[PDB]
Design a binder for these strands. Structure first.
Lengths: 840, 805
DNA sequence: TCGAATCGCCGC
RNA sequence: GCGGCGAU
DNA sequence: CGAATCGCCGC
RNA sequence: GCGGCGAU
């Protein structure tokens, strides 16, 4: 209800405590220590204010039970209510006479569901008319709504196709409106048994809630009952109050939670070097200390305390030390255009389907608001730190070891954020620096599928356009028309500077180089796949290699062959419909024209574990369904048959193109499945080998543990929200994408330390496979990122090491099931050193 | 005043809510209640022990020694210490012992006076005496080289007065020499010593509120209360132990404030590392070991009960030099100490004498060696072993009777002869064994043996077989011990054939005495050394005795297995030629001088040093694998513990690193010896976070070999239980025992596990794989290579009868 | 019978 | 958890 | 200066 | 921590 302010004493400690102050002051002076500790203090202040506004809205909406401060108490009272429900039902049955008027109503709703519906609706009613009648009414109408529309949910098979559309709607009235529509539809089909719901009358609903209110006072006792003006027929009223201890418990938990949810901001001094698991980054001893590894359990964090990973610690601290500053020139442009357009680069002037169209505009209206709120935060943070000579971002890691910045405004964000951020410590650009400055500008414009010589040609041909954009960014919109506009505009400014000030010009712009498909690149390196490696530019090639265009080419080759040969159409009975043959289906697709657009997402999702089944849903939504809406797709007479046909063709094309990827992810999936199973002798039933997690260690020395854990029980209501064992399926789903991500994290970490030690590089722009530095150091970073990758996969056999980790854990029945290690290929790793387009 | 945790807290250990039916359905309610009563009582008994100890410290002003008073003192010392220097600055600013010691001496003397004259003068006068006592005596400490010699004698002295008498005598000897300065101690003015006191008191009240303040008095009390609850006197189980399914909670069934831990670790973090580890075979061994059902040998107990009332030690004295006078004092302390342990062991054995079976929970140390949890357990002294026998029995049979005879002759001490002789000794004394069994009080022959109570328990069973034939059921454990487990294990992994004969690992016609082997080699050097030796040369001026001259004395005295004996048992523990020279003097040169012999040794230390290099050289050629291994593991640990810094920069390339290895059973062990950066020691008063390089080096070789034998023991019990019917195991770290019928099968199993493990695993190479990445670029050139494999075949091990393991 | 990557921000 | 945004 | 572990008792 | 005893 009412929460005392954390801020007055406990946030005051952040600036007061001497040991955090002295440690900061010794490194960077008292005054930078003053600013940093006050800034970290404000970060905690902003975070507490964030909680208070959300709590106020949730209290107003009756959604306090949804808030985290109210979840712990509800978990305690819920069993007591349920037990009292079940006993009441048994006690009412035992007694003889007319059954109480709520008995029948309470029965169709699950005893768990009534329990939560009463607690939430009573908490909603009390925190937002305390009379028992209004709350009993409010309970009853909620019980009936779960009763009437629940019938649809459990029926179930049809509900699975209406489940998503229910979720896509926001707000109870919209959820209820949609459910009245489906109920009418399914009643017309006769699915619900043809039984139209007879609405409860008001006096019934009142009696439903009162029995619930009584039942909580006996069992739980949070609410208590009070009678006003007893014995007077006019004013005899009964009222409901919350137990103060329970209100104090949410209030204590609300305050406890507000002090541990800061809004992290950039540092005005270099971030605190990591010496251990906790307390890196920000310098204050804080209520929410940073962790080196972002984990879901304290235990998975504790495993890292013992481990000796000097190279992991060095890489994070080097990355933290990178000095950034706000690009004021970009910020000047963004401050203007943002006031005029919701998205500044969105609409530049330049020279059943209806139901699906309505869903699109609804999503578009959501997307506009969500996009703009992120924009407003980034600009405000950018304008805040604009006048600082440098700022710094702390770094930590996810549980797989990938590196992420900690502050909400960070260099790993969207274009506008990336454009608003530049490095602080620049060097004179030089001939080689100018060259990569133009290559970077070419990539920001979207000229990336072309060799470097034509990338330079594109920049130099558009010299006058680039110059005009830098001189008047508001008068020439050409930069906004580019693929990465603000980052392109950032290049335009530095390009203009080099021409004004020559090659002596000091440029501090981050020149990002990104691996084309890092997962397939890594998988191709492990098993030495030549064909896969060439497709992802691991091996030197005549031109840049587009894996989508390659797969599209192989798809089109099948289509042309399946147009001359291939099955005729046939008629199949279904519970008679025509089943289109491959010859018909090929003709439809050739009529559409299959490009890299048709195959792109399928290749991207390959590292995530997607296969032929998942491609059909991709193909339908990405190309076929938009084609029908556009008035194309007359060829797609049966859309699902076309998608399934094309998904087969994409999967065959992908698997023969990158064999190492397909084989390696299968081997890891088989490993996790065996380890995640419980081994029980069928006759005895006893479990011989328990369910086991998956663990490996990166060549960088980062350990990682995959323990996806499933909760035992869960509850779900239609209109109100729902409120450990190893999850074997998530273990198999996650093992291959997580393993390859742990490798690219090690590659990134090994790159920054190698670029820092062999070469002089001190500034790093890092987005998981994108490696950036100032132009003067661009050539060496290009060198460094290739040298690391060749070294690890010459030094280490990551899959064989992985096998050595879990081979002991395997049970004797499982060993025949385990596949062998995939065969190595003919690729030579030293060709990666001379590969122009790997970028990594 | 200490609150009684026992009232509410020892109801929590009872845990009379976790269904005792969990125990009661499987084993019966009375036994379940008794077990829960026993664990409850075990916690109560320990609390009473703490209280009696605490009171005695209270009477003697020793509360500052007690752990309950420490955590305040460590909080209050630096605030005090800061205030000492603050006045030191103020007095230095205005013209008009260590600071830590002044703080510690003030706090201890004040707390003692209040614990046991509350006047401000009386305490300051006592505090003034201690500071003056520290200054005069501390001059000897800070001189220092001679202090290193007298330090050991101060440590042997006990009681503030008795250390003072010694330091008084040494100061005279130093001064009658003149070593401390010739300046006698200048006695503090009695009014100045009270002035120093008052001054230190006044600082204490300003720095801390302790002067005693109530909050500090309840802090000792609440901590003392918590410490009485976590120190139980563990008792044997009357039901089978709870199987270990995890890191904690095994063994005893009751939920406790101090649950059992699978691995005994000094740090909670070291225990936490074992939770993630999957070691199924380690868990099996502990659970089968816990499942062994024991019974108290009543016949042994009746004999023990009477002789313990008549003799301080039942078997010590049977009717059949100033340093020496210090030793008889030690014997008087010895005679006491054994009696307290004896009386408790008798008390427990009588307490459980009527139970049809008792069980012992098990856990392990950080090296993985398996220890029984109860204070009364089968890993005790000869009388404790004799009081305990297995409950499960099988008819003895011809094979079992043979091993019963073999066990008896080992208890008699005939363990250096072949098995047919060991058999023969028994029937030669067959009439004496009967008489000992028939009337143990009338015949004292059983007490004369090397392991009398075990030999008496053998006498009872040997009589029992003769009464009822081979049909008679015997449940007595028959323990067989490897001659030297460390040398055996080291010789196997490096395939040293020469070592294997010495430890009887190879099949041999006769038992091999490794002490005899090294001694014969020493004699051979000594004989040659008389023929060729460095001449005596004179380097006051003293003549150094030539190697031939030193040989002549040693040859006149002679060298026997006993002289070499220690240097090889110490060798597994890591002792070296430097260490050897002392022990040779103490064991062989010192008793000769008391005997009147040692006339030949003109200089004892010259003989000890000359001897020392002869055992070490003879040891090195006798067991080359054991020496060659131990250097490699030590060399590794030294590199891991060292810090690598850029010589000019000092920036640390590699931190001090602990060493880690995994036993073939899968038990992991991490060796992290840690040394505090600062420590305070006072001469007259009690003494009060980096890897310790010397401890890491000193410990790695013996700790590694212990982890292997524990892995072997754990492997042996699982192998013996699964391949063979054996369900009852008597285990003492390398001694394997079972009922006589099952002995021959365990006799087989202990070989098979040892052979199978070293054929399958190269343990030292695996150890390299663990620290290989940790080694720095400078260290890799320094690191020695792995010692070479030898020509020993491990298939010979299963054939040897004398290895016993 | 079922199902068909990680991290953050905002909203409920 | 659900809805949307963004990063790889 | 620097020459095994685990218990119990005592200080 | 130091001293004594025991197990290996």
């Amino acid at each position: 209800m009412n929460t005392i302010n954390i801020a007055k004493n406990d946030f005051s400690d952040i600036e007061l405590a001497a040991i955090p102050f002295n440690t900061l002051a010794d490194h960077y002076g008292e005054r930078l220590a003053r600013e940093q500790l006050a800034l970290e203090h404000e970060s905690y202040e902003m975070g507490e204010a964030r909680f208070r506004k959300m709590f106020e809205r949730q209290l107003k909406a009756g959604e306090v039970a949804d808030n985290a401060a109210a979840k712990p108490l509800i978990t305690t009272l819920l069993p007591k209510m349920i037990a009292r429900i079940n006993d009441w039902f048994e006690e009412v049955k035992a007694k003889r006479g007319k059954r109480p008027t709520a008995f029948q109503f309470l029965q169709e709703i699950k005893p768990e569901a009534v329990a939560y519906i009463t607690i939430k609706t009573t908490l909603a009613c009390l925190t937002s008319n305390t009379t028992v009648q209004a709350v009993a009414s409010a309970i009853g109408r909620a019980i009936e709504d779960e009763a009437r529309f629940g019938r649809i949910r459990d029926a179930k098979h049809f509900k699975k196709n209406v489940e998503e559309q229910l979720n896509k709607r926001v707000g109870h009235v919209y959820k209820k409106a949609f459910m009245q529509v489906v109920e009418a539809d399914m009643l017309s089909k006769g699915l619900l048994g043809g039984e139209a719901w007879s609405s409860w009358h008001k006096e019934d609903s009142i009696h439903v809630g009162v029995r619930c209110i009584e039942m909580l006072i006996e069992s739980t006792g949070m609410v208590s009952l009070h009678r006003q003006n007893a014995g007077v027929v006019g004013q005899d009223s009964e009222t409901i109050e919350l137990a103060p201890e329970y209100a104090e418990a949410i209030a204590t938990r609300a305050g406890a939670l507000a002090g541990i949810s800061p809004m992290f901001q950039p540092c005005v001094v270099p971030p605190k070097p990591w010496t251990g698991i906790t307390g890196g980054g920000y310098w204050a001893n804080g209520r929410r200390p940073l962790a080196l590894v972002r984990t879901h359990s304290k235990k998975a964090l504790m495993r890292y305390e013992d481990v000796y990973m000097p190279e992991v610690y060095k890489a994070i601290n080097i990355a933290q030390n990178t000095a950034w500053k706000i690009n004021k020139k970009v910020l000047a442009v963004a401050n203007v255009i943002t006031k005029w357009k919701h998205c500044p680069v969105e609409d530049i002037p330049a020279i059943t389907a209806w139901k699906r169209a309505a869903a699109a505009v609804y999503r578009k209206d959501k997307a506009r608001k969500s996009r703009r709120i992120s924009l407003e935060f980034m600009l405000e943070q950018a304008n805040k730190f604009a006048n600082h000579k440098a700022i710094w971002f702390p770094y930590n890691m996810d549980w797989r070891g990938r590196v992420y910045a900690v502050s909400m405004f960070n260099p790993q964000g969207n274009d506008m954020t990336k454009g608003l951020l530049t490095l602080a410590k620049g060097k004179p650009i030089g001939k080689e620096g100018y060259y990569w400055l133009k290559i970077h500008g070419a990539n920001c414009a979207g000229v990336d599928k072309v060799p470097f010589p034509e990338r330079i040609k594109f920049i130099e041909e558009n010299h006058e356009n680039i110059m005009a954009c830098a001189k008047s960014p508001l008068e020439n919109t050409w930069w906004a028309e580019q693929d990465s506009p603000f980052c392109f505009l950032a290049f335009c400014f530095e390009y203009a500077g080099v021409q004004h000030h020559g090659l002596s010009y000091n440029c501090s712009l981050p020149l990002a180089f990104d691996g084309s498909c890092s997962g397939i690149q890594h998988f191709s390196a492990m098993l030495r796949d030549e064909v896969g490696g060439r497709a992802v530019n691991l091996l030197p090639s005549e031109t840049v290699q587009d894996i989508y265009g390659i797969v599209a080419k192989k798809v089109n080759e099948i289509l042309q062959a399946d147009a001359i040969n291939g099955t005729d159409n046939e008629v199949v009975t279904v519970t008679e419909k025509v089943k289109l043959g491959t010859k018909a289906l090929a003709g439809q697709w050739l009529a559409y024209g299959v490009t890299r657009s048709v195959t792109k997402r399928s290749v991207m999702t390959l590292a995530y574990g997607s296969k032929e089944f998942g491609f059909r849903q991709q193909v339908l939504e990405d190309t076929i369904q938009p084609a029908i809406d556009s008035g194309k797709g007359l060829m797609f007479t049966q859309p699902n048959q076309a998608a399934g046909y094309m998904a087969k063709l994409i999967w065959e094309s992908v698997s023969v193109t990158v064999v190492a990827a397909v084989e390696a992810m299968n081997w890891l999936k088989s490993a996790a499945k065996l380890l995640a199973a419980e081994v029980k002798d069928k006759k005895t039933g006893e479990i011989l080998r328990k369910r086991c997690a998956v663990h490996w260690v990166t060549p960088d020395g980062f350990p990682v543990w995959q323990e996806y854990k499933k909760p035992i029980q869960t509850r779900l209501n239609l209109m109100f929200l729902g409120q450990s064992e190893i999850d074997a399926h998530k273990q198999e789903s996650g093992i291959a994408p997580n393993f390859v991500h742990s490798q690219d994290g090690s590659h990134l970490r090994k790159t920054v330390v190698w670029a820092h030690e062999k070469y002089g590089i001190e500034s790093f722009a890092l987005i998981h496979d994108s490696f950036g530095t100032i132009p003067a150091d661009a050539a060496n970073l290009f060198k460094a990122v290739r040298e690391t990758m060749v070294d690890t996969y010459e030094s280490c056999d990551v899959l064989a090491d992985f096998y050595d980790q879990f081979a002991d854990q395997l049970h004797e029945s499982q060993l025949d099931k385990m596949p062998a290690l995939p065969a190595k290929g003919n690729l030579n790793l030293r060709d990666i050193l001379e590969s122009d387009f790997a970028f990594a």
